[PDB]
């Protein structure tokens, strides 16, 4: 099993750059993996921000959030990084990270699917 | 600090003559102790080990004996070359310890 | 706080209980050291100090591996040799009764038959000398093994003699051996080495006695799996031999019957002279002594107040009823009866006469259907040899009685093996391990 | 007792030695690693001889250790396999006693040094990417 | 007889060139040396032949030239081996020749080598330790 | 066999720290060997004043001259230094450095003595 | 089409009369000749 | 086949120090070849200046140039250079890299020979 944990500060002021941890336990980050990024506002929907291949390194993001949203990785401390310029008071949400893979073990071939409990962040002056 | 006891402090003896020197520990130290012997103007030269083993090169007439936490050096037969003095060397545990040294004079006419 | 990490280290002395498959190496003969690696002028034995090790005599792998070999050597020494399939004819025996003493009265048949020759639509009239344990009545017989199968007969260059062999292991595993002295072949061993080769070890075919064998360095050796069950073979290894001198003093003669193209068969021609039976001496007072050192010894496991018995054979075949043994190339078995006769309760010149008898056809090991002639041998033959050790078989053995009786046993070759190989083992060596260690790569 | 040297020559002459003493020795255990009813056997042996070292070397090449007598690695030491100090295992046990005690963990030291062995190849071909 | 270039790709063609010419030929020669009456012999010779490059192998492995063709060591040049100089050595002399001069002290410089190996691993993991 | 020679300064001045050296020849100083270093004073009996493993390292000193003397290897240079800080008039002596061993050569087992030549030291200002 | 190398500036040592490839040549052949007989016809009755 | 191109400056002021550089394509510098500087003059006879030998190092040259003539090699940018110190008139010349050597591959032997195309070099104020 793959778990994931978030971590970062509660708060950021308007305008500022929020920056997100999510650490891997029991599995590498250099793996081949997709680390997903997504949020929920407030009463309100999901809504997916980005993702990274923790092998090739290649990321995907949304084009809402294109020209202000970074995710990277880091292999030797096993953990990746998300990066949001620009916060406004929009982007209060809670932000999880997650992943979901395929594993075939010899005969057998299982989903597994693994997310985190959440970081709640505020974005206000 | 183990305490090594030399007895006599000095003798004096002819050639041809036995000669016994007795060394005594504060403790048990079973085997671990070494007879050496020194020249003047010259470094420690070991004459036995183990108690009753000798080493390659010395003069079979060199003995050692163990009578429980004593111990004695005997020289069936003295030689010219065996004057000098001689020291008991334990070191069953630490600090190694030597003995108050006991010095074999020449014994001629006066 | 530890901080500790994993460190690989290759070479590390450890070693680990294996089975392989040891070879040859030694210094015409059935057991062939033509195929052996010649042995090393100068063998080196490393000694290990402070290990203890633990052996096992009666559950050793290299006896059965020696068994084999020595079963597969004899197969092979005996395939370029003649087959003796026409003498299976009706042969016409009378008696022999001229300058026979009163205990050879019978012992001897003189048979006529005919036989083949090198042209396949002629035949010949011939006579030999058989002996009355390898003929059956069918004033007619024939040869017993007609009845079971026919068996060629042993080439006469090909000697019997036993010669040394050393067995050595391959590369990565070792041979250690127990230099522990009182050892008794289980349990724990303090004093422990490690060896290249095995030493000579004579192949010495022999039953009720140990001949030509090694004496134990500090006294009277027993050994038994289970002394309290009877059903376990003891082992008894001598400090000092007892010597035994065997003879046939028939003076014999052979001759060679062409049976075909290539092909002879060695018949006994005639005795010169006088004919007396084979007999084997051994001397009394120094047997007396080895009895005494014996029963002293089990007086140990047997308690200290009980009497001791020897007495003899319970029964059965010949092969395992006598001393049966090979000298001179002529298989002997003696009624080893006035030896093992005697009683013990706890508190010069002369010596020992064995009646032997002679045979031909020959059932080396315990099998059916693969027998051996052996050629008669001509003249006299005498041999001396050691007396080194005992295989005894308590009888009865019941808590009703407070007697010991033991009697002589024997049958299975694979205890004459175990009394030399019984100080050896062969372990396989794991070089590679793990440790903790402060590093970090 | 105390303040004596000892030193080994011998095939298996430190197999009786504490672990500390007997790690000097090694290359004397590495030579001899590798070196018609008996030729058959002679030649089942020289085989069965050949293929245990080279499972051997490619045990050791998998891990990063290739060409090496004392390699060590990145995986930090459980606890759960082991509770004793450095002082009491290097200066007063034996390897035939350390192989006897850590027997039962060896597969999973063995998996973890291939899995960190692949993971530091990718990582440098990373590093050398740029 | 001066300013003349000489090449050779053959498997022994520098066998007569002079040892400085002949050190640049190397892989050549290396990749050679791995590759019912018959086939006995074939199977023999190839276990023999596998035998005798597994012995090289390991040799050239314990002194930690390992997966190296030219290797210099920490082991000073003994003057009592020889005592010519590389410009007569390298430029005036043969292969053949000098193993046919040095044949005699061969095992000692192994035995050097091997025990310089064994310390300076010692040494490193010392280092390491830190 | 091991040769040991002893070297060092002839005079030190008093409160200053005593610096000798002894150098191995025929032996590696990583090896299993225990180095001792030993004092005689002017007519007076010998006096051990510590020794080191080549090994391990760990060295062990006299009660009496703990806190003050330190002894430390170099097997790169092949020797082993002594070091004896606040010397005083009393510490004047001819010092040697010496090692004992058993050799088991496979069969075989001989104990071996080595001692040096040693150096005179006089401590005075 | 088989490899020849010459060796340039190199002299060797030859001896015929103590080459080893011919006893190994003759053993084979003897080898050889022997198997070939293997499976043919015993004339033992001819001895008539 | 191997190919030599030669380069440096057109004009060399009188007692500075001319450079030249002759590229090798098809061989390396390192192997064992000899590299040949000559140049001819105008109007006139060739004269060899001097050699470089590609394995060992060692350098050959003319007694007339030596001294000032330094020739040296380049295994990892497979070129080698020449040097040539108080250049004065009559240093003008065509200069050329050349290079001679046997073949022998297998059964066969070959002589090849290599020259340059040249670089004229004017020495003049
Ligand atoms: C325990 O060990 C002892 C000794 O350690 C053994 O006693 C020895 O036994 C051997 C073998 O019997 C014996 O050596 C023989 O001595 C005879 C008398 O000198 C020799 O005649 C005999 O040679 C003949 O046999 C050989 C084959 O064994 C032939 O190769 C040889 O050519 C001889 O044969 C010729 O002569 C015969 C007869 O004329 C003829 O038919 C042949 O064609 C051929 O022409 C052996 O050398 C020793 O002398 C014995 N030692 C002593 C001290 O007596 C004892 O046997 C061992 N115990 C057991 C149970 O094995
Ligand atoms: C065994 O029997 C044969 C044949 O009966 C005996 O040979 C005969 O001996 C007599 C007496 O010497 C001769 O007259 C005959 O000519 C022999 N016959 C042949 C065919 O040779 C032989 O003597 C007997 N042997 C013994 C020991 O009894
Ligand atoms: C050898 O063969 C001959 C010939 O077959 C045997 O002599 C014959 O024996 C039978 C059986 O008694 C008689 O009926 C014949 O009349 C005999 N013929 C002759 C010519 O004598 C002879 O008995 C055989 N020998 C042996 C020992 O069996
Ligand atoms: C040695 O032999 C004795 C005698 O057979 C063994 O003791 C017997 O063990 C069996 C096994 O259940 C019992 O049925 C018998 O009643 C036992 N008999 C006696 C007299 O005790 C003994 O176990 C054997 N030793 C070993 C180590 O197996
Ligand atoms: C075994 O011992 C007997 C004696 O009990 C020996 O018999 C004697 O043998 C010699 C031979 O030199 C004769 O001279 C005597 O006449 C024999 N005496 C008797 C009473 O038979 C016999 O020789 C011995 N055999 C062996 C092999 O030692
Ligand atoms: C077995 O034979 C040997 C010699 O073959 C005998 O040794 C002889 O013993 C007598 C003592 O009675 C000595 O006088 C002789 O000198 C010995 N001969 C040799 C050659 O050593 C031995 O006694 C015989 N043993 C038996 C039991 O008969
Ligand atoms: C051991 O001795 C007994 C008696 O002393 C032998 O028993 C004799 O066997 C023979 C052969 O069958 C008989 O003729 C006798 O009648 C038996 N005697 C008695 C008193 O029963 C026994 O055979 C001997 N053992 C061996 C192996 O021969
Ligand atoms: C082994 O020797 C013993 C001792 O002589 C034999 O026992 C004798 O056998 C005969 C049979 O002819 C009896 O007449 C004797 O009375 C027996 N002696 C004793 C003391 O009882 C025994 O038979 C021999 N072994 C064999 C198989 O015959
Ligand atoms: C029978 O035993 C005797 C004594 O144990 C053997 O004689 C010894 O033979 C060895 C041969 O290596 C010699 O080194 C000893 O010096 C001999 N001992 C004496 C007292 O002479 C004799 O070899 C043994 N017989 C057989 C056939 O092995
Ligand atoms: C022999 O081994 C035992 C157990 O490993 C150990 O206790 C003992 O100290 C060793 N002997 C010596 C002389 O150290
Ligand atoms: C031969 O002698 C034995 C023993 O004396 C006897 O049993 C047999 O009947 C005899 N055979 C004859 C005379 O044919
Ligand atoms: C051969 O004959 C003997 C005696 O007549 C008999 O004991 C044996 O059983 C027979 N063989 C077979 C295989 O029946
Ligand atoms: C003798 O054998 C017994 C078999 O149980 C064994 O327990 C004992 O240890 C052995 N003797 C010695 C000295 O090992
Ligand atoms: C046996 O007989 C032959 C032939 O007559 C004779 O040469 C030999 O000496 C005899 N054997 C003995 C021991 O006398
Ligand atoms: C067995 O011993 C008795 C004496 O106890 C004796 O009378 C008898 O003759 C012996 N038997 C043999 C065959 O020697
Ligand atoms: C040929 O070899 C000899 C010695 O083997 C050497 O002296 C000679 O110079 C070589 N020839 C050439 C052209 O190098």
């Not at chain 4, 891990?63 to 295992?89: A, D, F, M, Q």
Request: with cysteine; aromatic share 10%.
């Amino acid at each position: 099993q793959v778990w994931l944990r978030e971590s970062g500060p509660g708060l950021v002021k308007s305008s500022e750059t929020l920056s997100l941890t999510c650490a891997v336990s029991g599995a590498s980050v250099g793996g081949n993996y997709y680390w997903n990024w997504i949020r929920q506002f407030p009463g309100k929907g999901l809504e997916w921000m980005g993702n990274v291949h923790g092998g090739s390194g290649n990321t995907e993001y949304n084009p809402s959030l294109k020209g202000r949203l970074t995710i990277s990785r880091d292999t030797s401390r096993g953990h990746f990084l998300l990066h949001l310029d620009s916060v406004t008071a929009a982007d209060t949400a809670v932000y999880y990270c997650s992943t979901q893979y395929w594993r075939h073990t010899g005969y057998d071939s299982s989903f597994f699917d693994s997310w985190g409990q959440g970081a709640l962040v505020t974005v206000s002056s | 600090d183990v305490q090594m006891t030399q007895s006599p402090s000095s003798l004096s003896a002819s050639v041809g003559d036995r000669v016994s020197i007795t060394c005594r520990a504060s403790e048990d130290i079973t085997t671990d102790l070494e007879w050496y012997q020194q020249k003047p103007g010259k470094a420690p030269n070991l004459l036995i080990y183990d108690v009753s083993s000798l080493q390659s090169g010395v003069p079979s007439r060199f003995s050692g004996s163990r009578s429980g936490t004593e111990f004695t050096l005997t020289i069936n037969s003295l030689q010219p070359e065996d004057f000098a003095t001689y020291f008991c060397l334990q070191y069953n545990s630490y600090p190694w310890t030597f003995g108050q040294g006991t010095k074999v004079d020449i014994k001629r006419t006066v | 706080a530890e901080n500790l990490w994993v460190t690989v280290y290759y070479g590390v002395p450890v070693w680990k209980d294996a089975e392989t498959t040891l070879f040859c190496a030694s210094d015409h003969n059935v057991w062939a050291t033509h195929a052996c690696v010649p042995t090393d002028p100068n063998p080196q034995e490393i000694h290990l100090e402070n290990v203890t090790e633990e052996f096992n005599m009666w559950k050793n792998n290299m006896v059965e591996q020696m068994h084999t070999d020595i079963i597969s050597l004899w197969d092979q020494s005996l395939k370029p040799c003649v087959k003796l399939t026409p003498l299976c004819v009706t042969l016409q025996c009378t008696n022999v009764t001229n300058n026979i003493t009163d205990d050879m009265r019978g012992e001897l048949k003189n048979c006529s038959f005919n036989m083949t020759t090198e042209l396949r639509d002629k035949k010949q009239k011939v006579y030999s000398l058989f002996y009355r344990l390898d003929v059956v009545q069918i004033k007619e017989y024939r040869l017993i093994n007609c009845n079971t199968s026919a068996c060629t007969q042993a080439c006469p260059k090909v000697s019997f003699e036993p010669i040394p062999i050393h067995y050595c292991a391959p590369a990565g595993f070792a041979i250690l051996k127990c230099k522990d002295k009182k050892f008794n072949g289980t349990g724990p061993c303090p004093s422990v080495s490690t060896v290249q080769c095995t030493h000579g070890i004579k192949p010495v075919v022999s039953t009720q006695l140990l001949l030509n064998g090694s004496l134990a360095e500090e006294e009277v050796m027993i050994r038994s799996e289970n002394i309290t069950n009877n059903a376990k073979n003891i082992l008894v290894q001598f400090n000092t031999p007892v010597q035994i001198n065997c003879t046939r003093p028939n003076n014999n003669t052979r001759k060679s019957i062409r049976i075909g193209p290539g092909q002879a068969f060695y018949a006994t021609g005639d005795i010169i002279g006088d004919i007396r039976q084979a007999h084997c001496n051994v001397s009394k007072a120094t047997w007396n002594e080895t009895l005494g050192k014996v029963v002293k010894q089990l007086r140990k496991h047997f308690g200290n107040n009980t009497i001791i018995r020897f007495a003899n054979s319970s029964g059965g075949d010949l092969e395992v009823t006598t001393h049966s043994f090979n000298c001179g190339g002529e298989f002997f078995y003696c009624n080893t009866s006035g030896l093992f006769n005697s009683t013990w309760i706890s508190n010069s010149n002369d010596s020992i006469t064995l009646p032997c008898r002679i045979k031909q056809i020959i059932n080396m090991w315990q099998r059916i259907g693969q027998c051996m002639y052996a050629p008669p041998i001509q003249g006299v033959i005498r041999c001396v040899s050691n007396i080194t050790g005992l295989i005894l078989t308590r009888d009865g053995g019941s808590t009703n009685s407070t007697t010991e009786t033991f009697r002589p046993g024997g049958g299975d070759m694979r205890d004459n093996w175990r009394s030399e190989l019984y100080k050896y083992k062969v372990v396989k060596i794991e070089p590679l391990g793990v440790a903790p260690t402060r590093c970090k790569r | 007792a105390v303040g004596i040297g000892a030193v080994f020559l011998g095939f298996l002459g430190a197999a009786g030695s504490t672990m500390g003493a007997a790690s000097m020795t090694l290359t004397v255990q590495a030579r001899n690693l590798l070196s018609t009813v008996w030729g058959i056997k002679q030649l089942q042996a020289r085989v069965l001889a050949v293929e245990r070292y080279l499972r051997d070397q490619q045990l050791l090449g998998i891990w990063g250790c290739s060409g090496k007598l004392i390699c060590c690695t990145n995986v930090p030491w459980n606890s759960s396999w082991s509770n004793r100090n450095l002082s009491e295992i290097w200066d007063n046990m034996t390897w035939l006693q350390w192989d006897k005690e850590i027997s039962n963990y060896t597969q999973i030291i063995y998996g973890l040094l291939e899995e960190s062995q692949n993971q530091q190849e990718k990582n440098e071909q990373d590093l050398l990417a740029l």
